[PDB]
Design a protein around this ligand. Structure first.
Ligand SMILES: CCCCCCCCCCCCCCCCC[C@@H](O)O[C@H](CO[C@H](O)CCCCCCCCCCCCCCC)COP(=O)(O)OCC[N+](C)(C)C
Ligand SMILES: NC(=O)C1=CN([C@@H]2O[C@H](COP(=O)(O)OP(=O)(O)OC[C@H]3O[C@@H](n4cnc5c(N)ncnc54)[C@H](OP(=O)(O)O)[C@@H]3O)[C@@H](O)[C@H]2O)C=CC1
Ligand SMILES: CCCCCCCCCCCCCC(=O)SCCNC(=O)CCNC(=O)[C@@H](O)C(C)(C)COP(=O)(O)O
Ligand code: SF4
Ligand code: SF4
Lengths: 94, 18, 52, 97, 52, 337, 176, 208, 44, 42, 112
């Protein structure tokens, strides 16, 4: 923490550490904080809620089934093929 | 150490004869 | 990496193995004082990775 | 400006008062606020790091068996309850009671 | 929200350990890109699901 | 307490055995066979915690309980007996320490143990003494142990008393000793051959026998004595020792006095001397062959022959050239009896 | 999106060729890295002076357990026993019996740090907020039998730290 | 019905449906049924003998360029004429999508190994062999992993106690660690959380 | 420790707003009352 | 009113590599070296 | 129905005899290389006993499956996989004796 050293240090580095000095935190966030109050949540309205709607687990349904082989025509893909990606734009190479 | 006292508390024969 | 565990430390209460993600979403909300703190670190990390 | 630094070593040498003992046990040096309380002795500090802030100092007579320079001080020795909360930065902004 | 973040995946080439290494580093930088975006768009609201 | 469950590491048993001086070869094994039963033990240390440390695994959480004590203070021995159902004496010493004069070790301590065993209403007391403890001019250990034997018998008469017929094991101070006599050069025989004769019992057998003796209702005041199935000649015995240790074998015939000059020479060392005149008298006196006393087989246990078990005991003495070899190659030694 | 690490290739220009050759013979990047560690010699060391200083923690941090009292001096625990019912390690064992007054209470609440995983589910679970995962984090001990805390032990921990714990919960509960 | 519940796209359900039909027609010597789990996961069945031929084509192009096993799971169920129920995830890259074929197997019938077809399945054959009884034919080297040496009984057999039948402990008299029956302390307290009142009308089997 | 006065039904929480025992209603005046865990009886 | 910690603004963060072109021309290396040699021999 | 290996019994019994040859001959090497101090005979006898343990199995496929599970062990001892502990494990030597006599068991514990 002295100019006699910091100059030599930065020159030895070729990066000039003094702008960051990230290897220590001289003065970060203060620890004590004001009370949170904190968000309410979307469904907390008393005027209109019905769990019969909002429920998700009750929307679970038995799997759709096909063939059940146990009990022209055209060819087709599981999904359309994805496009080839564009190459990084701003930094094409590294 | 063991906590919560005892269990069966089994009875024993009387001191008096017969 | 220790400074990152300071974050798991801060939000989860454990330095690691932070059982914090929940099937329902997430456990407790994260403390107000955190995001600037993450900012201050993240801006300076790159010099470190670079020097590596 | 090495002379000012060595001079800082001197001022620290005087303010510490027999710093040789503190470096014979507490391993040096600079000290600060010297706020205190606890069951015995204790200490406090403030300086220039998020980790080096808020030091401590074991009681010379300790909780019972004598603890001092060149003695086996406990880590559990620190005062129970209040002081760690200021000491771990759980609430360093909240000064020790 | 990876739909809503933008970052560059780093492909290797030769398949030697070295390329994998550069992939490790570059992916570090890219994650370091993600942190920016997440910091800049971090909506207020609840965190656990409403479904009690 | 009434015993519960299958015998096992978690199993309870009524035994709250107290073993004294277990730091030695016996009864580390005896504690172990207690431990496989899961029976509680209160082994108390005189020495230092460190040497005792390997005793710890043997138990199951709360089982083993070290306790600080001294054999000299009366109440100090009142400590570790204080809840013991049974108290067991395994204490012994070959070389007379200064501060523990050779007599008290075999007299006072068993004495205080016996009478405190009386006062605490201890359910059983048990004690060890060498078969040759029967009084003899050579060696003060046979005699001092005879004195504490007769004393505890006079004080806790219903105590059974061990009289082991030389136990051989990996941690032995005996077989390893004559194995290590090679280091000087030869093997000092007072006059070779039948100058003296010995019979041995597996250490494992002695341990199993002791705990079985607590397992035996009949083993009350009876003075048990342990002898191995085979009979051997000291000369052919040592011959078998270097027959398994593969080391060169040099019998070393010797006028009887000079060997004692040697023992006096080696008692000098402040530490723990390799040899002593007391041990010198441990050497040349043969075991008596009396079987009529209650003993090992009376417990129902049968002795494990030494002949298959010396190999593991002495392999550490082997030179690398011979360090791997089947025991059977050595040839079973002939039995005199 | 996709990026080429490497793939970039050296120029064959003679100035560049002599540069790479001189680089090989004269070890430029080598001395570069060497200069780099020289540079890290001059930065201030990161070590904290433990014990004498101790690392930063958080109000939410988890450590030694400790049942704790009402300000009234009454104990909080009411043996709803679901602390047993939610601990994944099932470290907890409880055996309630009625108070002579008729209030619900434990007889032998106990726990064993040997199996506890410090997940803090108990901290969440208690309806009366009795058991609490205390700020203390150091209680390493010699003997296994000491780990297996009894109820009384937990209370003593609750006595030792109560101002401290109440401080953390005071600083934290709103986020709960 | 928006903020909480997942939207579930119709589209993917369509494409997977039709594709399931597509394979269903291309090779129906063995596709028992091509059920689509409603959250977009196709999964055809296979007669146990039919494993290699199906999977083989499953790498082979038509669209089924589903290279790389993700896994070779072995669900167990005590009922059924044959208990163990093997499962194969698969991934196609260019059409970025996953399917999941699966079979069934006797405790004793040796189904063939599928290492050649999906390539990276050599480790799995050993896994399921040592976590189950089931044997894979034409496998170069089944052998134990994820166990001790001896140990014997397969775990994950849906029965078979988690505490097993054994324990090691070091024993000074023999100076060696050794096996010994469990003697377990504290006992695995076994809660019975499961509760009355069916939660799921949308399922629930016929009373029969 | 001493019982709080009442007439009649009244709250209890153990005094810790979202820190005490969950809110309940003791229901006595002249009679001794309650309680949850808080001993806060309402004998008066 | 309520609060929590949404960002108050936060400027952009660095990430791309920034390796300096420290060091210099290769000819200079040989030049200085060889000059050192000849002065040495002299 | 697909057989594992051999069709019908006897074809599988020869397999097991082969296996006995392999084990038996290998055993002295096991005692030598492992520095086991078991009596060189004892391992052999114990082998014969383990071979008696399933000496009543009669199903078709189950026996060949038995020699599958039998290969792996000699497979391990030959590769020095397993160890002194692991191979000494079979002798159950640390166990406390457990007589099968009704009365004997009867005094000892609550039993089944
Ligand atoms: C009149 C004219 C007379 C002569 C004038 C010309 C002088 C001749 C040229 C001088 C060259 C001498 C240099 C010594 C030989 C260097 C070759 C060495 O580097 O071999 C390489 C191997 O490199 C060495 O192993 C480096 C490892 C040494 C680790 C220690 C680091 C030294 C730090 C610097 C200390 C300097 C102190 C002394 C300075 C005065 C192998 O090359 P290659 O296989 O193709 O690929 C690797 C290239 N490298 C160099 C980038 C690694
Ligand atoms: N082959 C044999 O060895 C035979 C032995 N015996 C007898 O059986 C007993 C068991 O033999 P073994 O266990 O090998 O002998 P050990 O020396 O191995 O056992 C004696 C143990 O008791 C301790 N001890 C006894 N008294 C004291 C004391 N006053 N102060 C401090 N420590 C004491 C010893 O030292 P510490 O605990 O302090 O380390 C030692 O640990 C012996 O007494 C022996 O005479 C009988 C027949 C054969
Ligand atoms: C040294 C100790 C360590 C190793 C100890 C021994 C290792 C052996 C491992 C055990 C492997 C097996 O036993 S596999 C199955 C063996 N097969 C049987 O037991 C079959 C029983 N059925 C029979 O008919 C038997 O009586 C016979 C002997 C096969 C009859 O022979 P047949 O006349 O051909
Ligand atoms: S929750 Fe806390 S208080 Fe309620 S029962 Fe479980 S432990 Fe006792
Ligand atoms: S600590 Fe974590 S794990 Fe141990 S009991 Fe409390 S909650 Fe369950």
């Amino acid at each position: 923490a002295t100019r006699v050293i910091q100059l030599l240090r930065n020159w030895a580095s070729g990066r000039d550490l003094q702008a960051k000095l990230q290897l220590r935190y001289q003065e970060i966030s203060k620890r004590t904080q004001p009370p949170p109050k904190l968000p309410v949540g979307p469904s907390h309205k008393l005027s209109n809620n019905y769990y019969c709607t909002r429920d998700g687990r009750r929307e679970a349904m038995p799997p759709s089934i096909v063939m059940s082989s146990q009990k022209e025509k055209k060819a087709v893909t599981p999904a359309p093929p994805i496009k080839r990606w564009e190459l990084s734009k701003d930094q094409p190479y590294l | 150490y063991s906590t919560t006292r005892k269990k069966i508390q089994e009875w024993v024969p009387p001191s008096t004869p017969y | 990496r220790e400074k990152m565990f300071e974050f798991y430390e801060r939000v989860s209460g454990a330095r690691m193995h932070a059982a914090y993600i929940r099937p329902g979403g997430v456990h407790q909300d994260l403390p107000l004082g955190l995001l600037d703190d993450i900012y201050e670190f993240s801006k300076n990390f790159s010099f470190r990775i670079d020097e590596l | 400006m090495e002379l000012v630094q060595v001079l800082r070593r001197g001022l620290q040498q005087v303010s510490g008062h027999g710093g040789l003992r503190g470096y014979l046990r507490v391993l040096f040096r600079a000290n600060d606020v010297r706020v205190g309380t606890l069951v015995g002795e204790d200490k406090y500090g403030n300086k220039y790091y998020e980790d080096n802030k808020q030091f401590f100092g074991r009681h010379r007579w300790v909780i019972y068996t004598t603890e001092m320079n060149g003695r086996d001080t406990f880590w559990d020795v620190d005062g129970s309850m209040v002081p760690p909360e200021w000491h771990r930065w759980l609430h360093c902004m909240t000064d020790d009671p | 929200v990876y739909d809503q973040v933008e970052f560059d995946v780093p492909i290797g080439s030769r398949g030697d350990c070295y390329d994998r290494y550069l992939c490790r580093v570059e992916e570090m930088r890219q994650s370091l890109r993600i942190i920016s975006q997440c910091l800049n768009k971090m909506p207020p609201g609840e965190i656990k699901v409403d479904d009690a | 307490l009434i015993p519960h469950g299958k015998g096992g590491r978690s199993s309870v048993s009524g035994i709250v055995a107290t073993v004294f001086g277990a730091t030695g070869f016996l009864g580390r094994y005896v504690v172990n066979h207690l431990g496989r039963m899961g029976s509680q033990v209160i082994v108390p240390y005189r020495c230092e915690p460190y040497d005792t440390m390997h005793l710890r695994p043997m138990g199951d959480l709360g089982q083993i309980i070290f306790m600080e004590w001294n054999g000299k203070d009366k109440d100090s021995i009142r400590k570790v007996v204080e809840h013991s159902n049974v108290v067991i004496n395994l204490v012994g010493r070959e070389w007379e320490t200064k501060n523990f004069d050779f007599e008290d070790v075999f007299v006072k301590i068993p004495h205080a143990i016996a009478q405190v065993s009386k006062e605490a209403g201890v359910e059983k007391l048990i004690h060890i003494s060498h078969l040759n403890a029967d009084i003899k001019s050579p060696s003060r250990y046979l005699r001092s142990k005879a004195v504490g034997e007769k004393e505890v018998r006079a004080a806790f008469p219903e105590a059974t008393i061990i009289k082991p017929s030389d136990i051989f094991g990996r941690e032995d101070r005996f077989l390893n000793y004559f194995a290590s006599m090679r280091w000087f050069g030869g093997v000092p025989l007072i006059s070779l051959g039948k100058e003296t004769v010995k019979q041995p019992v597996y250490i494992v057998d002695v341990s199993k026998g002791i705990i079985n003796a607590i397992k035996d209702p009949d083993a009350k005041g009876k003075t048990f004595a342990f002898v191995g199935p085979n009979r051997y000649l000291l000369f052919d015995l040592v011959q078998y020792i270097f027959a398994v240790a593969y080391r060169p074998f040099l019998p070393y015939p010797l006028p009887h006095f000079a060997y004692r000059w040697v023992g006096r020479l080696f008692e000098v060392s402040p530490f723990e001397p390799w040899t002593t005149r007391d041990k010198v008298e441990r050497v040349h006196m043969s075991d008596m062959t009396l079987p009529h006393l209650p003993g090992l087989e009376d417990l129902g246990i049968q002795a494990t022959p030494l002949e298959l078990k010396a190999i593991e005991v002495l392999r550490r003495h082997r030179t690398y050239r011979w360090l791997t070899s089947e025991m059977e190659d050595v040839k079973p030694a002939k039995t005199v009896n | 999106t996709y990026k080429f690490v490497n793939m970039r290739e050296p120029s064959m220009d003679m100035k560049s060729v002599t540069d790479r050759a001189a680089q090989t013979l004269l070890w430029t990047e080598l001395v570069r890295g060497l200069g780099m560690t020289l540079s890290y010699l001059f930065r201030e060391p990161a070590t904290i002076n433990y014990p004498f200083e101790k690392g930063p923690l958080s109000p939410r941090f988890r450590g030694e357990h400790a049942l704790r009292r009402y300000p009234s001096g009454e104990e909080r625990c009411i043996a709803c026993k679901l602390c047993e019912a939610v601990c994944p390690a099932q470290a907890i064992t409880i055996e309630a019996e009625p108070r002579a007054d008729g209030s619900r209470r434990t007889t032998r609440y106990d726990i064993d740090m040997t199996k506890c995983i410090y997940c803090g589910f108990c901290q969440e679970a208690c309806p009366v907020d009795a058991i609490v995962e205390g700020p203390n984090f150091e209680f390493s001990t010699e003997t296994h039998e000491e780990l297996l805390y009894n109820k009384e032990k937990l209370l003593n921990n609750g006595d030792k730290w109560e101002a401290e714990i109440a401080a953390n919960i005071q600083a934290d509960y709103l986020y709960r | 019905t928006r903020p909480t519940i997942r939207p579930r796209n119709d589209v993917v359900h369509k494409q997977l449906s039709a594709f399931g039909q597509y394979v269903a027609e291309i090779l129906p010597k063995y596709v028992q049924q091509v059920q689509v789990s409603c959250f977009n996961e196709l999964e055809i069945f296979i007669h146990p003998d039919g494993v290699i031929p199906v999977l083989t084509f499953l790498r082979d192009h038509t669209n089924a360029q589903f290279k790389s096993l993700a896994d070779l799971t072995a669900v167990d169920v005590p009922t059924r004429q044959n208990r163990f129920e093997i499962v194969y995830n698969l991934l196609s890259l260019r059409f970025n999508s996953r399917i999941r074929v699966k079979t069934y197997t006797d405790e004793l019938t040796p189904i063939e190994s599928s290492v050649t077809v999906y390539k990276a399945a050599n480790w799995y054959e050993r896994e399921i062999w040592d976590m189950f009884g089931v044997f894979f034919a034409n496998h170069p080297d089944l052998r134990r992993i994820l166990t001790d040496y001896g140990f014997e009984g397969h775990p994950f057999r849906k029965d078979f106690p988690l505490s097993g039948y054994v324990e090691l402990r070091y024993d000074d008299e023999v100076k060696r660690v050794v096996a010994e029956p469990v003697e377990l302390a504290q006992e695995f307290r076994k809660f019975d959380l499961n509760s009355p009142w069916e939660a799921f009308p949308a399922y629930r089997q016929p009373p029969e | 420790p001493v019982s709080e006065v009442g007439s009649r039904v009244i709250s209890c929480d153990g005094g810790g707003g979202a820190l005490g025992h969950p809110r309940v209603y003791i229901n006595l005046d002249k009679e001794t009352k309650t309680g949850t865990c808080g001993y806060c009886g309402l004998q008066f | 009113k309520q609060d929590m910690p949404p960002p108050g603004g936060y400027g952009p963060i660095d990430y791309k590599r920034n390796l300096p072109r420290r060091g210099l021309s290769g000819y200079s290396m040989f030049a200085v070296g060889i000059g050192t040699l000849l002065f040495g021999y002299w | 129905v697909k057989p594992i290996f051999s069709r019908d019994m006897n074809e599988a019994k020869r397999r097991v005899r082969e296996l006995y040859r392999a084990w038996y001959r290998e055993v002295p090497n096991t005692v030598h290389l492992f520095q086991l101090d078991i009596s060189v005979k004892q391992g052999r006898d114990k082998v014969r006993e383990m071979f008696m343990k399933n000496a009543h199995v009669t199903d078709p496929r189950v026996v060949d499956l038995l020699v599958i599970k039998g290969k792996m062990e000699l497979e391990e001892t030959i590769n020095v996989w397993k160890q002194r502990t692991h191979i000494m494990r079979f002798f159950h030597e640390t166990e406390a004796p457990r007589p099968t006599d009704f009365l004997s068991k009867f005094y000892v514990g609550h039993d089944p």
